Amino acid sequence: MLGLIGKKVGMTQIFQKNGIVVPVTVIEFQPNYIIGKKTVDRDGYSALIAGSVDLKSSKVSKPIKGQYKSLKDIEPKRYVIELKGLDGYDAGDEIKVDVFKSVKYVDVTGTTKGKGFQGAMKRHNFSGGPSSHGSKFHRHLGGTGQATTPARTFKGTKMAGRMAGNQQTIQNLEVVLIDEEKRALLVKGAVPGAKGSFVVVKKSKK
Template identity: 50%
Template sequence: MKKAILGRKIGMTEVFREDGTVVPVTVIEAGPCVVVQKKTVDNDGYDAIQVGFMDIKESKLNKPLIGHFKKANVPFKKYLREFRIADAPYNVGDEIKVDIFSVGERVDVTGISKGKGFAGTIKRWNARRGPMAHGSKHHRKVGSLGASTFPARVLKGHHLPGRLGGERVTVQNLEIVKIYPEKNLMLVKGSVPGNKGSLLMIKDTVKVNK
């Protein structure tokens, strides 16, 4: 990873390319972010930068965080995240803006997916339902939980009902369609995880660009 920034999901829309094709895009408010801490192998055992995003009042923070920001002599920020960037060309107090990326580059976007609450196996695991007629009483039930003789228990990892969503999800290899540096906006092709206004981590893709 060489480039990374924090952002906020604004919503989805569509744009037209020069050849007239329509492209669905997600609008992301990316940055500006400030470097709050720089970690090195000598002091911390690994190379990384800690980045802050979105201003917040001092009264909203606890004492350890207030001291952390004051030590770095940077504005108070709502979100703090770490990016493992080796030999990062940043120092504490430097600002990271959306113009570190360019149109056509590919990025990986990480966020917390929408929470769906308690869900059954059909919605949660895309299981097939049972017959809906001829006296069948097995419509949307779980189905077989395993053999009764051996091992006579439900094996770990079995697809069962439970909470759906609300997990950390990364969508890889998304194309940057447009960038508006003056507005700190980035338009990426396709959808990204999370609700409107949720925090996103945008990094250059780990996949090889063809």
Template identity: 45%
Template sequence: MINGLIGKKIGMTEIFLDDGTVVVSTVIEAGPCFVVQKKTAGKDGYESVQLGFQEVKPQRVTKPMLGHFKNAGAPPLRHLVEFDPEGEDYNLGDSIDVGIFNEGDIVDVVGNSKGKGFSGTMKRHNFSGQPASHGGMAHRRPGGIGQASYPGKVWKGMKMSGQMGNERVTVQGLSVVRVDAEKNIILIKGSVPGPNGGTVLIKRTTKGRIESAAA
């Protein structure tokens, strides 16, 4: 069975389990996704299935991509991502929904974190800052970023001010709390990267962790 789906983050809520435990969960609309392309080891060097998610108007898609979707018998879609079919045979145009997941499954969720804009080192890298009183004039400045004539440059990777957030982030080992196949909704314990309405990838974990949804 394919190891993941594309989804859209809806928001967060609370779920009460049978024993009264409250589980804070993220609501994700996962699928339906359509099989748009199949890649084989003989032709492409590896096995994968390309899934598409979120239908769009035909005029929003380029002509080459319209042909791509037409060949697959699928509607025009906004997002395309490849997943490992894990030995399962799928046909072009097949629809895959959230039913591939079960309550208690452990998943990894990939998304783009919320953008924070241009941020200083105290916010971006958790610098402690410099003296706030006694005549100090460099309260939130980063401090030194290198040496003098040697090496005469700023080393790559130096922690400095810059764009914060809007990066690809993976959160691993999250539990599936609820699955609603009729509404294509999946509830995952805890928080996942990105804003409400952001696109996320839900994949079965590769680390083999086993825990209950109430843990």
């Protein structure tokens, strides 16, 4: 599956030729290199290891350094991922942004924004109690279980706790524009993560 490690620059909008506005998210692609390969007869499966923006030479541990010993003029890469079942490339290669030039839809994977310790009403769209008529119940859970049967709280009951921070992959984002000179992709819609967080863009499954 064709994929790339990009950085979510932000959002903007563009004007189609006839006047229709399209709200887009912009992704900037630092150069991506193929660092190694995984093979079915040696690792158990076939995948390509892909890496991106470099690290500072004072903060590269020697295991990471030795990972790149045999590669020529490829500094250590901070973001490393795997592309399963891909061919057409080998160690030392380098993937342009134009691999999406023939693609209509993409999928983007990133780390969603963190919202801290969040309550039930925000986390699960719980309604609350009334704010008047004598109510002493505003944004609490309400009841949680049943009385004596089962005499416990079922596993998976939704309560308060941390919100957000998980990975998530959003599907079928239309591809609006590709700009090779500035290494940018413009997709239509929202992309998980805060500004400057790093996403992975894959060719759409459908």
